[model samples]
Target: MSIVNILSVNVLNNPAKFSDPYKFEITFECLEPLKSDLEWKLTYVGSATSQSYDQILDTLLVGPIPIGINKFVFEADPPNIDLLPQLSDVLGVTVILLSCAYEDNEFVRVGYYVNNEMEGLNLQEMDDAEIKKVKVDISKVWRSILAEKPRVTRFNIQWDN
Candidate 1:
């Protein structure tokens, strides 16, 4: 298990302002290029507190995604978050990426984890001065990447072979 540093995150048709537009545009630095299939698992929690109940929304498989600073835009339709009315109860979500390959005719796994708050930081609203200061922070690099067009890539996974 390794901490996959998420470089950027862009949300389209945010549920805070809309409904069910569960699309995510995410970019991250690829520490190592992978040759096998990749998979993503999404987990949602009602609150950040320890007592908050958590649920696994879905396990989305994609790839063999290219290595080295990759950007992905994906739509994930959850099974309807019924507790939206609680507002504060909707805490955040976690996305896990896995690199799977075969070793000695068997499967091996390496994974990364990204935990993000449901209500994300709207960097667009910040002034240039404030944004400049923020751009220096490692955890906030995603804010700067949001301004440019996402670099796109494609891959196909062989699930049956």
Candidate 2:
């Protein structure tokens, strides 16, 4: 058994645009009182190839957690567009990870698969305003987490009860 148990992670403001910030309502149970802070981190996986494209969206520290249950609301900016190798890569399936650690040892991790899709031609050099507007309309991007199928993992961490 571990020191902490996750009850639920609620996705908030999902199915957002590329520029919209990511948000979550996290709830967990502490079997015993924790003296140190719980380190929380949010990471955006930019590519399946390497970690070079990856970005750290945000990191926070919550401390002196009491025995019982607690809730946390996390918000972070979206992945940087400039960091992405290509605009095409930005579309389709993406990944974001929410991890929490006690001390320096990580105990739990949550994975969210985000889908960003566009439904039109992605080419430039349109002389007609109407065509450009139509392309823009078609290129409208919306994103969402696979909330029904979030990946949760628990690891062994030494905690003195």
Candidate 3:
């Protein structure tokens, strides 16, 4: 099995004000592309109301991200109020982890990047019965993040597949 390493996460574009914050762009790079489907699960660990909260954003269908650098542009509803603030705010220190998962046989583990460190999160493979129940939840999450019909524009690039 082949494993790829993540390099860095960057903010390409952020909303000027909270009101019009639906459109956002974030970029990250990986060393290479493994043979698998792509999904991004974001985790936010921040302080709110003098209490720390750990939140998981909806799973994004990233499709297939090519090797080298990849950029994601999201034009949908913001995840949560707490996550919105620290997205660009350097004042409040928060740990943001972006995990990537690949479906391999009966297992799919998530590899994430946090604080410039590589970590692994478990993405358990679903059994026949469990997959049916989770499918509804997955569809619900997909609807929440999609404001409009998602589009895939063509870009000229050479594939190393």
Best by lDDT: 2
**lDDT of model 1 at residue 127?**
65
As a whole number from 0 to 100, the lDDT of residue 44 in candidate 1 is 47
Q: What root-mean-square deviation over C-alphas does model 2 reach?
A: 5.5
| lDDT by residue for model 1 (27-118), tens | 76555545554455444443443554555555556666565777887665453445443332232232222222222121322222233232
Spell out the clash pairs found in candidate 1.
8-142
Write the residue-wise lDDT of candidate 3 on 1-161 in tens digits.
23333333333332122222233355555456655556655554454334556666545666566777766664433346454333222112334344555552212222222221111211244354443333222111211122122222222222234
Between candidates 1 and 3, the one scoring higher on lDDT is 1
- For candidate 1, the lDDT comes to 0.41
TM-score of 1: 0.43
Candidate with top TM-score is 2
Superposed on all Cα atoms, model 1 deviates from the true structure by an RMSD in Å of: 12.8
lDDT tens digits, residue span 1-161, model 2: 68788899988887777777788899988887767888998888865555667888888888788678989898887777677665555655678889999888989999888876665544343344534344233236777788888898889988764
Off by over 4 Å in 3: 14-35, 48-52, 65-71, 74-92, 104-161
Q: How many backbone clashes does candidate 3 have?
A: 0
lDDT comparison, 2 vs 3, better candidate: 2
